[model samples]
Target chain A: EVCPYLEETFKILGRSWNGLIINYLSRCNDCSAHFSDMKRDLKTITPRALSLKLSELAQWELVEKQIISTSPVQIIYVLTEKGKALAEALHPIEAWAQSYVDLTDQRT
Target chain B: MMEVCPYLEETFKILGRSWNGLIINYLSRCNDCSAHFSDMKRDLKTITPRALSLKLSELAQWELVEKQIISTSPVQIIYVLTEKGKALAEALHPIEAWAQSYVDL
Candidate 1:
């Protein structure tokens, strides 16, 4: 009856790009990534979209944004410990995806 | 420039719906590898017949489950996970462990 944990996880996952962003950040060194680097790696994602997602994740306490420099407004996104825990929890699902899921078709 | 993994997207889309995980978990953990519609309705408690049937239908469409009819004197029907569906069930274990860790917190 207390499956709300998975329920709540799915609630956050319902957002289209949130999981991708989490997965991407976890792969980065120190579990962090620059905003520009994220956009560059995430191809076809808009700057505004990434900005909003980063803010949303930070609000959820799964991510934090650090303002490194005002020289051209440099910032980076890092997974909080909680976020790293979630990434680890998602490992089996990722492994399942690679094995059983067909990724050949792209739905735009 | 890699985008979101389409594979995970589809999996989440299937799971993102309300009550889907509950239903799938029931099928995966049931005493029988498969179960009758009434059993699911009774165990799920809050889910209506309409909701249960609809979620099962969605899972069937996703090829994660199948509806089988076993006919005796009276027709008996059951829902069971396919190989892909069972794989999904296995994938959920880590999340289940995570849930147990966080449930008390």
Candidate 2:
């Protein structure tokens, strides 16, 4: 039988933009970034979709929002320890893709 | 400047489908990480025969599995994980470990 736990993990990470978001945040300065930074960096993700993905990730405990004590009040999305753990798992896959996946064939 | 990774886009493109990852996980545990068609059919009873064939072919197309014909005597053929497939299966181990600790029912 396929492992239930593994399937559950897929249920979380398998969504459209979640993996991309996690990847972006994991490598960011201090593993945190402001909303505008993400909005700009993840080209093609609308502001609304980006916000929704971040909120869902936060609900999953993979990310948390920080409020910078006000001068000009600020908020940043931060990768939780759990999020980092997922990122670490992705490293091996990234390594494998680099070596083996055919870059030219984007849709295979 | 961390751009979105095409490698990741490609990887997720493969993984995004239903039954693909489960099929890979199932095959990974088989003896020698390979198995006969019928055995795969028996074990992964949830997959329709057509679905399994298409998915295995998809994996094969990605160079993740090699379909082998063992001998003509018994009309034998089996699906085997290629080196690439084994590497991918290995990558999945950490995801399994993480899920064990983190995912709730």
Candidate 3:
């Protein structure tokens, strides 16, 4: 039997698109990126879903938002320490994803 | 821009479904020990019989769970994890531990 924390963790991590978002953010240099970057990259996700997912991750402290004042304005997302910890936890999942199943056909 | 792993897609497609991980986690503990539908329903308090049946069916179809007919007197059926499922559960153990770290947080 698992505890409530594991339930919550899976709830957040296993939410559709959340794991993808985490994977994308973790791979970026500095472990950060912008909404548009993620949007353009993960073409399948709608803006509303992406925004909502980001909001949820932020709420869970898995991601932190930053505002950089450029010519207009700029906002970026970066992984928090907790977020990195989660990424570390997910490393095995990524590895398993590579070796656990033969998904070569699905690779882009 | 990251190349999404298709295995991640497959894994989450099964695991992302509510109660899938919990069911797998429960089955992992059993190992050689198998469980019946009623046993799982009893163990996972919030699970409905219908939900349990559906999840077990899905897991069986995915080949993560194997079904056996152990009795005919009352028509008994038991479920056990396949080798693939055992590896998956082992991989997930760390995530469970990660969740444990957040218990008091």
Candidate 4:
């Protein structure tokens, strides 16, 4: 509610789909998700899409990256405890989005 | 409990502290007194005492810097922030500190 981490989090997560990634992460606890699953989860995504998000999140420690343990070496992503806490804090921002979000959608 | 911005409101207040410049935001937020206060006067190379002194004043807003007279001739100094100040730094550091958290070369 204080949005304590808002500024810094926004500074870090505001980039790319980091915001959406935060929202999506709220739905789950563990950071286990396939690349395709991540793509499908977000409203609009592409191959170059989620990969970019994944890389950024992994770098920031907002999420954990587990490289494929088997063939092809795909990566699995999960949110860190820090990220989960942020998700809880950012929910109201999403709620604010319901109405005002659409009005400014075209601008961004 | 009552909701408060005590957690996340540092935004510009902390990062934008004074003499007050870049390169030092406390030698990692891992310390309450020394790690931050002690390093404020670090003999570490590449940092000037003038800049450090000035910068210390800026962060002092959060009590990150303080001057105590424990010793007269030595001018014993103290650099500390109130609990509120600590909270502000922690909030603003979500990114900056996190940046330091990672082991990147």
Candidate 5:
């Protein structure tokens, strides 16, 4: 029973853009991504919103920050173990959506 | 895969909407008794009758909520989770565990 905790979980993940960001990071090579990379991929998200979402994910330990270099101050983000498990769990929702929900129709 | 499916996007759209998750949470806890409109409105103090009605109808269209009319005297309406809705709630278990574990981290 996820009763109470479910809300908190959704508070972090149920954002419109958060799940897509995580999905992108999970599928990336080496499981490491950068803000620029994400911004490039998620064209619709405003820079302010993306930054906010990433910070939120990091605060929740769903994503971790890494300093790849200091010469130019390179930084990257990777999914934590918790985030990985979340990505795995998301597969079923994806499957369910595909099977039952119509993606093309917004009417539903 | 490097691609995130549109299907997941659709699912997220529903879950991402405000009050939808809370509504589902309330229904999940209704094991003691079926959820009624006023009952949920009372439990979720901030929710409006209009908003709750819209959310319930939307969930019903998605098959996430099954509505039944037991009587018409004063009018009795109950809401329950459909099979797919139960599965959706079950799918959230990992997320709940993750959130609970966060305190220790």
Candidate 6:
């Protein structure tokens, strides 16, 4: 029982570049990056979809939103520490993704 | 803002116990059987259907297929493991399905 779920959990988190985003935010503490800054160091995500997905991630509790109590209440998004921890939990999976990315690069 | 999901991940797994299957699993895991959603919500207060659907999608993507379809359609039901869902369910004992019978009990 333990073996299977442990395996499945790893596979699930590796879905698409989902893990990369999780890993990126988990490492950063800043919540005020613009879309360009946000997309930096990330692969192939279009701005519109990345923006929408980030919003969804916030609502889903995978990330948290901080409202700057400034004029107009601007918003900033940050990965919750739980989000950070989740990325750590997926570290083995991340290494696995990195390996695959490397291999694909070598092939091309 | 550094709050953990508070093990919201278990809430992730436990969220799908939709009928007694989960309650059955919980009791079987013997976690805590009586904390039942305050029992009063009964589809009344907890969430809108849209959120529930979205949550299910998230859960499915996470590969936590924790249900059995004894009920029928426009529920037109499906066993949604992708072309690769057995990845989750294929590793347990028969008594595992027994927890499912925990529902029948």
Better by DockQ, candidate 6 or 1? 1
lDDT of 2 by residue, A1-108 (tens): 678888777776656688778888999988999998888887888999988989989999999999999899999999999998988888887887787788776334
**lDDT at position B15, candidate 2:** 75
lDDT of 5 by residue, A18-108 (tens): 8888878888987788888888776677889988988888887889988876898989999998888777767766667777777556554
CAPRI-style quality class for the chain A–B interface of candidate 1: acceptable
Best model per DockQ? 2
lDDT of 1: 0.77
> For candidate 6, lDDT tens digit of each residue in B1-105?
232222222222322233212222222232222212223123223445554455445545444433335365433333233222232222222324322332222
Off by over 4 Å in 4: A1-7, A29-31, A68-74, A102-108, B1-105
RMSD of each: 3.5, 2.9, 2.9, 12.0, 3.1, 13.9
Candidate 1 ranges with C-alpha deviation above 4 Å: A34-40, A43-53, A104-108, B2-5, B45-51, B103-105
- Per residue, candidate 1 scores C-alpha lDDT tens digits across B1-105 of 545567766677676567776677778887665889998888777778998888888888777889999988899998998888888888887777766665433
Least well predicted 10-residue stretch by lDDT in candidate 5 chain B: B96-105
- True lDDT of residue A53, candidate 1: 86
lDDT of 3 by residue, B1-105 (tens): 476667776777777677878888788887474787888898888888988988888888777789998878888888998887787777787788878886445
Candidate 5: segments with Cα more than 4 A from true spot: A70-72, B29-33, B44-51, B103-105
Candidate 6: stretches off by over 4 Å: A1-16, A30-33, A70-74, A97-101, A104-108, B1-105
Candidate 6 lDDT for residue A47: 84
Q: Which pairs of residues have clashing backbones in candidate 6? A: B27-B30, B73-B76
> Residue-pair clashes per candidate, as listed?
0, 0, 0, 10, 0, 2
In candidate 5 the C-alpha lDDT for residue B11 amounts to 84
- TM-score leader: 3
Q: Of the pair 5 and 6, which is ahead by TM-score? A: 5
Q: Is the docking of candidate 4 incorrect, acceptable, medium or high quality?
A: incorrect
The docking category that best describes candidate 5 is acceptable
DockQ, all models: 0.38, 0.53, 0.46, 0.03, 0.46, 0.03
In Å, residue A35's CA in model 3 sits off its true spot by 0.9
Deviation in Å, model 5, residue B13 alpha carbon: 0.2
In candidate 6, what are the lDDT values of residues A1-108, reduced to their tens digit? 122332223332323344456656665655334455556655456888677767766654666767788887766667765556555655433333333222212110
